[PDB]
Symmetry: C2
């Protein structure tokens, strides 16, 4: 009933906010719609898999907040398998490789690929992490889709196809669905193209031993009965001295302040009194989440390793249900498994099938890509289609269609009276990830501490010491990567020698 | 508590559905979130204006359902003034004209403009009104914005600027916000470019005497205490024998079936048990409504008529707050007024001003465009910013960003167990309009009558006889309009 702060949502962001407030001596309550905490993280436990992350799983260098929070809760990481070769499967054939990107041998195609990644990062440097609408060409870039930008930048079909797969995997959406400004912001605020796509030295380097759901569960353990499960919030009333928060199961909570720690569009599920200001009222109808089915196929052994494949497959082509896989074998070497994502329109297309039908298509694909009949012999299968979740809306995160980020982006984390906004979507570093959820939950909690006169303004945003366990190597380029011309740059050089 | 059908939403579509079900002898209840009926229609009455439509207002030929429904309820229409010349204001100068499109004189610009409109209608012919995702090029057209299509089709800036104004005024959204397939469908399902943009013989021909809010109000009068105001629906449970519908003010309604007659995205405000199917769960997060402030400036007389201007202005350019106006004077020549729309990004930009600051900007604009100091002497002002409305989400209607109509369009009308979907967004003719609200509410009602075994399947969708009061005249084209080449066409012959 009565408290200092109600936190709406018990995902990592709400849990990190509640913990900070609790540790600071305030009385907090977390109102969580589901019968569990964790939100877009979910660790399933059963005897066939031991444990498996069906939602968010990976962490890596530069994600220092989630690493610190998880360490403090007694959790450990291990490295995703990348010992053996990666595979790029394109036009029905597999090409093994090492390094962040498949090698390109054709010199023209090489210039085009090099220029594409370079230009993504060059554009990103123009876009402030905390205010992307302030980029010099924000309007021009927000008024085109990523499809339009790829059409302009890629002088080869090879580059355009790889770039397409890159966008679909990063943000679980099609290139024509998303704003170019927003996508360029999203990549830059994860540290750039190499950092976002990499396993070793990148976002996919590690997983938590025992699953990421432990982060939210262990914070629930610390907070005790302060976390109220099966309490979907339906109504927030700020017309009186204390804020009133009502739940679906007929309970009323009264607080000094509220943190909204849910995906922005899911604010639609709450009726507000007084009504939200115009810009937020419309913003929350303009910000969908992406579409993904996360699928894990189990085998007797990690047989791909014997063929010198690590289990990472980048798979192009419309017929392939899964465009990206990673080895999901336990660190002990047992419960061998391949994790794959069914992305964007394919999540919609293939949701029609049964579980058994999707397992069959995945095994047939993996058998072809790995050149291995053993892939047709799974021992177990788990999957989760995040598009079906009422209290998530999709995964991994919210995308912005053309025109929205410049017109409505300013209000995403703007307080509304005594409501402050957390959730990974409001982060400025690794927004969309477990890391961004921690950044945003703690920042929102500190906004409230500042409102209460407990901390000064300069303490609202707080830097994070680098993890000693997962240090980050710098992202570097070569002289030739920096200075080689693009294809039109080369054509201009050719024109000039002729003139 | 108990009834045959609960209708969620008391706009025109919910009211038309509830009236049809009531007239067939079912017990209906309408649950309306607001303290009023009418939704995206709203008629304000006061002594200064008598009455004024601050939401949807115009009706015209081919909109036979809304005309028949209003006539039955005792309403009359009058014609929007279009006796004198229209104005196109471009690069700071007014050019008066007659007919529905402004004249173009330069021969290259002429071919470009002619080809733009012609091509919009040619593309529309391949898009089924009841299934735009079945167009032969559905995916190609859905994956581009209208901005990308205009960049391809328009070889002149003049055409691109007017086409941009056209998109902004039709769907209160920017060309780069909307799918080309969806926008092309939207125009075709209103009868094409001439029909949607025209006052005489088009969508804006008429208004209702006393205001369009009277349609919802008079159905509420018929239904009496069956209409429950200040009952926002929060929860719908379909796990039991009868459907259970819960409101924010802690009431529970039990029915055999439910009609959802709210904008699609506003289904987000309801918690569902069991959860919605995947495709609808995601669809209702992908379908925003547009942005508009409707503004009405009143004057002592309709002074523009003395200069042989009817009050219609098409005003190009970024600086102008209002890109389109119509004369809003009453049929008797009194309560002289100009109605203008502040569209799309300008609604967002100018919402930060005060009401008095917006009034000054509009009057100065109108003084320039009408070439009249009389425009600087307003006697009254009313406006409504629809972006502020929790229970509308915007106006006039829902738009589809690129990629969404092909991936999710099929779900809009699909029943979910015993919930059927009305609302103008689900119509197949004049979706977005009061006409579409009536088509969809009556079709959803007849889906339920069919589920109850009261009518056969072939009576779910019903034709509408043409209005005797507002007959349609044919849309025609000239030989030259049909056959003049495009710009790249003339370049092939060169
Ligand atoms: C789904 C997914 C996500 C994901 C990913 C793969 C998939 C399939 N891969 C990731 C990865 O490897 N590494 C990483 O860091 N992130 C990746 N993600 C994204 C990650 O899971 C999310 O960024 C993160 O979990 C988001 O956390 P946040 O706390 O911001 O949001 P949430 O988890 O959605 O939590 C919101 C909670 O709110 C409850 N809710 C919703 N509505 C209400 C109402 N009305 N009332 C009360 N509670 C509400 C939700 O139930 C949820 O618990
Ligand atoms: C806003 C606007 C609309 C408009 C226009 C100009 C403006 C500024 N110009 C028009 C015109 O000249 N001619 C025309 O035919 N239409 C034009 N429009 C659009 C027109 O107003 C709309 O197409 C039509 O009114 C839509 O009717 P519909 O019945 O489909 O939808 P609605 O009016 O939005 O009604 C929905 C009702 O539902 C209530 N609601 C919302 N959520 C809930 C919940 N959770 N529970 C219960 N009730 C709910 C809303 O309050 C509303 O009354
Ligand atoms: C007789 C000589 C004519 C040769 C002129 C060549 C025509 C150039 C067309 C190639 C388009 C390439 N893409 C990548 C699709 C678009 C680039 C965008 S941008 O042009 O760089 O702005
Ligand atoms: C001897 C040199 C001849 C000069 C010819 C120059 C022509 C360049 C202008 C083309 C741009 C026109 N837009 C409308 C933007 C694109 C058309 C779309 S599409 O080309 O039909 O795809
Ligand atoms: C496009 C789409 C998916 C991709 O995954 C990588 C990658 N995985 C591990 C190192 N680089 C690179 C890459 C490029
Ligand atoms: C672009 C934008 C707005 C427009 O309004 C008309 C119009 N109004 C009455 C007859 N034609 C034509 C037109 C073209």
């Amino acid at each position: 009933n009565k408290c200092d702060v109600v936190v709406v949502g018990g995902g990592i962001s709400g849990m990190a906010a509640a913990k900070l407030l609790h540790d600071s001596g305030l009385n907090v309550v977390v109102l969580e719609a589901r019968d569990r905490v964790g939100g877009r993280t979910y660790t399933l436990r059963n005897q066939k898999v031991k444990y498996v992350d069906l939602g968010g799983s990976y962490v890596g260098p530069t994600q220092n907040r989630i690493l610190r929070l998880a360490k403090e809760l007694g959790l450990e990481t291990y490295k995703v398998n990348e010992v053996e070769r990666l595979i790029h499967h394109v036009k029905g054939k597999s090409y093994p490789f090492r390094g962040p990107f498949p090698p390109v041998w054709n010199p023209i195609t090489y210039l085009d690929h090099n220029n594409f990644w370079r230009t993504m990062d060059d554009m990103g440097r123009e876009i402030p992490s905390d205010a992307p609408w302030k980029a010099p060409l924000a309007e021009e870039w927000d008024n085109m889709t990523m499809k339009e930008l790829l059409d302009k930048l890629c002088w080869t079909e090879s580059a355009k196809q790889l770039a397409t797969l890159f966008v679909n995997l990063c943000v679980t959406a099609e290139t024509h669905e998303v704003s170019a400004l927003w996508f360029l912001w999203y990549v830059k605020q994860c540290g750039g193209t190499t950092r976002i796509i990499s396993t070793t030295n990148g976002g996919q380097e590690r997983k938590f031993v025992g699953g990421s759901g432990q982060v939210s569960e262990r914070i629930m353990d610390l907070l005790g009965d302060r976390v109220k499960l099966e309490r979907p919030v339906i109504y927030i009333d700020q017309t009186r001295e204390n804020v009133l928060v009502e739940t679906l199961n007929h309970e009323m909570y009264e607080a000094k302040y509220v943190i909204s720690a849910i995906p922005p569009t899911l604010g639609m599920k709450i009726h507000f009194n007084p009504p939200l200001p115009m810009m937020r009222n419309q913003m929350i109808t303009r910000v969908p989440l992406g579409s993904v089915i996360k699928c894990i196929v189990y085998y007797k052994e990690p047989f791909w390793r014997k063929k010198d494949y690590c289990g990472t497959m980048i798979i192009d082509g419309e017929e392939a249900p899964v465009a990206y896989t990673l080895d999901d074998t336990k660190p002990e070497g047992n419960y061998a498994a391949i994790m794959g994502f069914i992305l964007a329109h394919k999540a919609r297309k293939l949701a029609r099938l049964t579980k058994e039908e999707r397992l069959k298509k995945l095994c047939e694909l993996y058998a072809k890509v790995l050149g291995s009949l053993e892939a047709l012999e799974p021992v177990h299968y788990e999957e989760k289609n995040w598009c079906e979740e009422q209290y998530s809306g999709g995964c991994y995160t919210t995308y912005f269609p053309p025109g929205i980020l410049t017109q409505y982006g300013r209000v995403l984390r703007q307080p509304v009276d005594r409501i402050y906004f957390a959730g990974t979507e409001t982060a400025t570093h690794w927004s969309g990830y477990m890391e961004g959820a921690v950044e945003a939950g703690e920042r929102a909690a500190r906004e409230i501490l500042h409102a209460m006169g407990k901390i000064p303004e300069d303490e609202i945003w707080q830097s994070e010491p680098e993890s000693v366990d997962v240090p980050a190597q710098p992202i570097t380029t070569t002289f030739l990567e920096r200075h080689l011309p693009s294809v039109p740059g080369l054509l201009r050089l050719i024109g000039l020698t002729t003139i």
